[PDB]
């Protein structure tokens, strides 16, 4: 469904049938609520505990097809542009793509073959570095986030006497906002995520109805406006 259909069925589901009908929502408000509902839905469906099914990214066909249009593959750029201080002397710093929402798969291609990057926790890092070896298992590499400015910088730890040729990252692209109409105005240009032009929902049509329902629920919680509704509907932001 295109943006006009988002807005028309938003109006239908919000106030065109309600008995003591409420004021219609302005297009900026509808775009804001739709973008919020989109992000909430993405976060709810990525995490199993966030939805009533207990199903995350790839726990069912529907969850695969939900994020299928939001998956992207890119590469981390070696961060030798400027000097820096790494926590580990034997780690190579890489910069992830700017439009990164969530990392789901990483791999590094070295001279000793491809290796799956395992994101190790800080307590896990301490445990592993208290051991005599201090290097990954055969077909794996280690990873920790380092000092990041304006984009995520990442330290890749591989086994000794190994060089990294490329660093691929299969991630979830940051969703683009849903903007119903050109938000340009003479009184001031308002933006949802830095863009005023019309922006279609760049995800699969399977969850457009879900985004619409969530947006309507958020609109009605805003209309109710007491602390109660804000608190319970803020639980699903996550």
């Amino acid at each position: 469904m295109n943006v006009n259909e988002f807005s028309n069925e938003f109006d239908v589901l919000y106030n065109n049938i309600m008995s003591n009908a409420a004021p219609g929502l302005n297009e900026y408000e509808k775009s804001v609520l739709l973008t919020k509902a989109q992000e909430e839905i993405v976060k709810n469906y990525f995490e199993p505990a966030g939805n009533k099914y207990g199903k995350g990214l790839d726990d069912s066909p529907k969850r695969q097809i939900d994020f299928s249009e939001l998956i992207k593959v890119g590469e981390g750029v070696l961060n030798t542009s400027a000097p820096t201080i790494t926590f580990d002397k034997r780690a190579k710093v890489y910069d992830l793509p700017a439009d990164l929402f969530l990392v789901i798969n990483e791999a590094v291609d070295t001279n000793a073959g491809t290796k799956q990057i395992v994101p190790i926790s800080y307590s896990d890092y301490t445990r592993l570095m208290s051991r005599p070896y201090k290097e990954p298992v055969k077909y794996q590499a280690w990873r920790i986030i380092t000092t990041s400015i304006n984009n995520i910088s990442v330290e890749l730890i591989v086994n000794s006497n190994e060089t990294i040729t490329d660093y691929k990252v299969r991630y979830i692209r940051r969703p683009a906002p849903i903007i119903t109409t050109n938000l340009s105005s003479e009184y001031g240009d308002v933006t949802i995520n830095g863009v005023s032009t019309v922006s279609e929902c760049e995800l699969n049509p399977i969850i457009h109805s879900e985004i619409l329902q969530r947006a309507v629920e958020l609109a009605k919680a805003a209309y109710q406006g007491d602390l109660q509704a804000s608190v319970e509907l803020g639980q699903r932001s996550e």
Partner: protein, 226 residues
């Protein structure tokens, strides 16, 4: 194996800092268990009470190769003067004080009474105190030109009962092994009086058995009340 290798292998065998429940020891604790395992193992090997080997001090090539580096030879001619013995012809010789078990022990005799046999090497026979009285007069098991009786007494001493004058006393014994100390211990701490690093002097063949025994002793120490 070196001290770094004792420590790294000991950690690997104990699964230190692995995901499963495990045990982690300090280098002093590691040194304590390694030295205890070393001394237990070599005493059991000498006496032949180890069920795995089941052989005594030099009963096979394996045990020879294991305890070859503790075998020290000693020679002395000085006699301790003022001491009370069980015979008029008793001379006392000091023991090297690092001795564990005496394995060979022989005595050279210098006396004019045994003519043209002077300097005869004589077998030093350890004799119990039951056997002493009936062995002074014994012509086949008592002191003679070719036999000397040795009795252990206080203050690390050997009372040699001989018919002829004893000139020199030769020994070959098992020595106190150097402890296995993996790190320069802080002030006050030491193992067998040693505070600095001490590598195992035995052969690398038995180092892995010592490591296994030390690991088992560590598990016993941590899991004897649970």
């Amino acid at each position: 194996m070196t001290n770094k290798e004792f420590s790294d292998g000991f950690s690997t065998l104990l699964n230190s800092f692995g995901i499963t429940p495990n045990i982690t020891l300090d280098e002093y604790e590691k040194s304590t268990f390694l030295t205890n395992a070393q001394e237990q193992l070599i005493i059991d090997i000498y006496s032949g009470r180890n069920i795995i080997y089941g052989k005594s001090f030099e009963q096979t090539e394996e045990i020879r190769r294991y305890l070859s580096n503790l075998v020290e030879t000693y020679e002395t001619s000085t006699k301790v003067t003022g001491k009370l013995g069980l015979s008029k012809d008793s001379v006392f010789f000091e023991i090297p004080q690092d001795t564990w078990f005496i394995t060979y022990e022989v005595a050279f005799l210098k006396d004019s009474r045994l003519g043209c046999l002077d300097g005869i090497e004589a077998s030093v026979v350890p004799l119990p105190q039951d056997d002493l009285y009936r062995a002074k007069d014994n012509p086949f098991r008592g002191p003679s030109k070719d036999r000397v009786l040795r009795l252990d007494i206080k203050s690390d001493l050997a009372e040699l009962i001989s018919k002829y004058n004893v000139d020199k006393y030769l020994m070959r014994y098992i020595s106190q092994p150097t402890p296995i100390i993996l790190v320069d211990l802080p002030d006050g701490l030491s193992i067998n009086g040693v505070s600095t690093e001490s590598e195992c002097e035995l052969n690398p063949v038995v180092h892995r058995a010592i490591l296994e025994r030390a690991v088992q002793l560590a598990i016993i120490s941590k899991t004897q009340l649970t």
